[PDB]
Design a protein around this ligand. Structure first.
Ligand SMILES: Cc1cc(NC(=O)NCCCN2CCN(c3ccccc3)CC2)no1
Lengths: 177, 179
């Protein structure tokens, strides 16, 4: 049965750890957000074919440009992430994450994931951004970035509400089959 | 409450780290050192390259560092001291990370399904590659847990700042040592 290594990369602002925890446990972690998600594997059927899905977090490694690539080899698919309410994380897709992923894994499929979809319509978040003369990242911005980096899909999800979250990982799998 | 949830994670994930290294040593390493199975000539007697100094890192955590963290369970605001006390021991993560690319190359080019075969046999969720990234993960993870403690500990917080300084410095030194 097919073994799939999936590595999740992106700025601290995406909430990588939270995303993976909320995916695997089927629930936002709630009170306390844990800093640690240990390498995971579980069975899922996708289009009727069962698969063993491996998930590796990368949180903590954001300032170590030569340590991050230790996780990259033999990866079957990347989730490159940005928070939908941090233009900086989105710019970093282009500036930081896609470059190092193509350098190390030139023929490995990428899904571009926008996280924190639930905050894109939040007044307080919207306002906090307007005070820095910025706005959240909208759908066609994602699509345009996905294209630019060669992503197989652009997807939007929330760990909080679970909207799009199961789909992210289904499509990660489909991109390898 | 936040300081308590963080210390509890620090401890729980420490126990599991020790468990995970222990597993790694008494399966993937023990097969090779035992002499109970057919060892590809390409990896033979190169277990020092494959596993690097992971034994010594395990001994540190299992003999000392987990026993000492446990003693800070009810003292979360002081746990930075623990990392200062044992700072020199974390220098072995520099050595480990320096060697990890050589370990990956080796397993790719010369080990075939040797370790895949062992995984299947023993029924392990984690590949040897999964186990062998763990030290890299763990050593970057401590500075996350200390930052979290800084967001919720008062003017008794030089007993974190210096802990953190150390645990920022170890991974940068590991990072700065790669070719
Ligand atoms: C990745 C990722 C994250 C995400 N969405 C979010 O992060 N959404 C915002 C959640 C932030 N809010 C603040 C704290 N809350 C609370 C306060 C007091 C006691 C208990 C709970 C609960 C949660 N979507 O993707």
């Amino acid at each position: 049965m097919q073994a799939i290594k999936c590595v999740v990369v992106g700025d601290g602002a995406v909430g990588k750890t939270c995303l993976l925890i909320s995916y695997t446990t089927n629930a936002f972690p709630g009170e306390y957000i844990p800093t640690v998600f240990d390498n995971y594997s579980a069975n899922v059927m996708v289009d009727g074919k069962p698969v063993n899905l491996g998930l590796w977090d990368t949180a903590g490694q954001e300032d170590y440009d030569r340590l991050r690539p230790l996780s990259y080899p033999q990866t079957d698919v990347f989730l490159i992430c940005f928070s939908l309410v941090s233009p900086a994380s989105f710019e970093n897709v282009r500036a930081k994450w896609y470059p190092e992923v193509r350098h190390h894994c030139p023929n490995t499929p990428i899904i571009l994931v926008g996280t924190k979809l639930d905050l894109r319509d939040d007044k307080d978040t919207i306002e906090k951004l307007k005070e820095k003369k910025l706005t959240p990242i909208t759908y066609p911005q994602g699509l345009a970035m996905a294209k630019e980096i060669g992503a197989v899909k652009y997807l939007e999800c929330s760990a909080l509400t679970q909207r799009g979250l199961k789909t992210v990982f289904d499509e990660a799998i489909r991109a390898v089959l | 409450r936040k300081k308590e949830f963080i210390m509890a994670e620090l401890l729980q994930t420490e126990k599991a780290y020790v468990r995970d290294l222990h597993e790694c040593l008494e399966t993937y390493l023990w097969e090779m050192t035992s002499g109970v199975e057919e060892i590809p000539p390409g990896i033979l007697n190169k277990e020092h390259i494959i596993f690097g100094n992971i034994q010594e890192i395990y001994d540190f955590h299992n003999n000392i560092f987990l026993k000492e963290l446990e003693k800070y369970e009810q003292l979360p605001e002081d746990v930075g001291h623990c990392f200062v006390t044992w700072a020199d021991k974390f220098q072995m993560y520099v050595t480990y990370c320096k060697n990890k690319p050589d370990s990956n190359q080796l397993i790719l080019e010369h080990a075939g399904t040797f370790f895949d075969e062992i995984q299947q046999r023993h029924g392990l969720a984690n590949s040897i590659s999964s186990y062998l990234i763990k030290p890299v993960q763990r050593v970057t993870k401590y500075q996350l847990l200390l930052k979290e403690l800084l967001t919720c500990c008062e003017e008794g917080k030089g007993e974190l700042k210096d802990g953190l300084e150390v645990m920022l410095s170890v991974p940068k030194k590991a990072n700065d040592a790669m070719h």
